[PDB]
Amino acid sequence: PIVQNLQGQMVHQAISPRTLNAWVKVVEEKAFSPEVIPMFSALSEGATPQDLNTMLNTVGGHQAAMQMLKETINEEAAEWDRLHPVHAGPIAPGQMREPRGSDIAGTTSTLQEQIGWMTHNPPIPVGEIYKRWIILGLNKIVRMYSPTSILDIRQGPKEPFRDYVDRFYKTLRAEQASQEVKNWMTETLLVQNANPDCKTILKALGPGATLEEMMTACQGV
Amino acid sequence: PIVQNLQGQMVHQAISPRTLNAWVKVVEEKAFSPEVIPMFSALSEGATPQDLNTMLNTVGGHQAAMQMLKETINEEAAEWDRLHPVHAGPIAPGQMREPRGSDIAGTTSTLQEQIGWMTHNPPIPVGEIYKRWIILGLNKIVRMYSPTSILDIRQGPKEPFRDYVDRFYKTLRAEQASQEVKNWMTETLLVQNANPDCKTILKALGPGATLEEMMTACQGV
């Protein structure tokens, strides 16, 4: 973000590797939970547009999500420009040229320009504005794809049961829960959360069906 | 069902009080288990439509289930009639008027007519047909509502939270579950299953909210 020299200039300080590592951990662990959004906001405090793009490049491997963010950003940038039409006239010595949508997204603007806008009196808060666009994007992402908590791990209508089992157990293993809670998860929730067609098959098995028997029973359902 | 006189007539014999008592015991004990359906079928062997209605009157106190059976029966009866349109012409001396949907459900038909249909050569098996409709109904009932369980204990949109807590804990105490599963029930499911307005309040409490604090927080929600 932004820090002041002993010589009085507002200069840029890159986001700490520890803040960055935390953000990447949040995304890794909190898949697409509503919980990501508040964390993103906390971690991106004070960020310039350059910093925000730095955070996003760190979780860019999520290509379908990055695509969703791109479209949101392009949309909001386009509306910004509609509300803030380009003005060709000269800039008075005590004015500052307003940012365009692409300046806010960091695409057509420099760090120096971002800092000049952010620390103006009053600010042109391009870090906060870009952050709002990203948050709009993140909300659209979570709303389109649901969280992944144990309880919300549900077999898809066409998901091979072996794949569902894997997801289920992976999610299970990463949780911090007591063994009695985990025992309920394996013995009842797994069937509880199977799709309609597999559940019906699973529920018609015997008293002591083994997981391997379950997989055999639901193969190609 | 149906039995033959020494004089050769097929006459009606009421269902034995012991068969009836067994069926009522099955329903009492096997709440809404898939197990009810095979039992119902075994116990209703040979039943005329009158007999089937006799069995249902015996477990009629289950009003939400009886309502579900009514709707299924009305639906199937309506399709029967579509497949079996009324024919106004005279009936030949060696023919028998076909049953309507309501005749099969026993509503517009007499025991004598039911027996006449059932023992025709070949039969018009109105007992078996009505039994299939009832079974369609029972399957819909089990599939819709689980047998008494903690997971489907949900606070009503206008239910005082103290009443929900009572129901929840009563259900909890009667279960045979491990302590770690019950700990998850009290610490997370109770909030999980609160209504939309109470959950939002509960989720905005601190790290260590006591149940008494929860009740205070959700009072009149």
**Domains of chain B by range and CATH?**
1-147 (1.10.375.10), 148-221 (1.10.1200.30)
Helix (H) or strand (E) holding B111: helix B111-118
CB pairs under 8 A between A and B: 29
Q: Could you give the CA distance from residue B2 to residue B116 in angstroms, rounded to a whole number?
A: 10
Helix (H, G, I), strand (E, B) or coil at B121: coil
Provide the phi-psi class of A8: left if phi over 0, else alpha when psi is between -120 and 50, else beta.
Answer: left
Q: Which residues of A touch B (CB under 8 A)?
A: 151, 177-184, 192, 203-204
With CA atoms as reference, the chain B residue closest to A182 would be: B181
Q: How many other C-beta atoms can be found within 10 angstroms of the C-beta atom of residue A36?
A: 21
Report chain A residues whose CB lies below 8 A from the CB of B180.
178-184
Nearest to A44 by CA among A119, A125, A146: A125
Residue A114: phi and psi, rounded to 5, are -65, -45
- Which method, experimentally, gave rise to this model? NMR
Query: What type of residue sits at position B120?
Result: H
Dihedral angle computed from the Cα positions of residues A68, A157, A152 and A23, in that order, rounded to the nearest 10 degrees: -30
Paired strand residues for A1: none
Q: How far is B180 from chain A (nearest CA, A)?
A: 4
CB B142 within 8 A of CB B27: no
| Contact (Cβ atoms closer than 8 angstroms) between residue A69 and residue A56 | yes
Using CA atoms, how far apart are residues B146 and B131, in angstroms rounded to an integer?
Answer: 23
CA distances from B35 to A33, B29, B130 (A): 39, 10, 20
Q: Which residue of A has its CA nearest to B186?
A: A181
- Which residues have CB under 8 Å from A204's CB, separation 6+? B34
Residue of B146, B184, B200 to mutate for A, most A C-beta atoms under 10 A: B184
Which one of A178, A201, A203 makes the best mutation probe of the B interface by having the most chain B beta carbons within 10 Å? A178
Tell me the backbone φ, ψ of residue A71, rounded to 5 degrees.
-65, -40
Select the residue from B33, B150, B172, B178 to test the A interface by mutation, using most A Cβ atoms within 10 A: B178
Rounded Cα–Cα distance for residues B71 and B205 (Å): 45
Q: What is each CA distance from A164 to A71, A143, A159, B165, in whole angstroms?
A: 31, 21, 7, 33
The residues, ordered by sequence, that sit 6+ positions from B199 with a Cβ below 8 Å of its Cβ are B191, B192
d(CA B111, CA B119): 12
Residues of A whose CB is below 8 A from B184: 177-178, 180-181, 184
With residue B71 as reference, give the H or E element that holds it. helix B63-83
CA distance B203 to B206: 8
Q: What is the C-alpha radius of gyration for chain B, rounded to an integer number of angstroms? A: 25
CA distance B143 to chain A (A): 9
Radius of gyration of chain A (CA): 24
- In contact, B97 and B13? CB cutoff 8 Å: no
- Which residues, in sequence order, are bridge partners of residue A11? A3
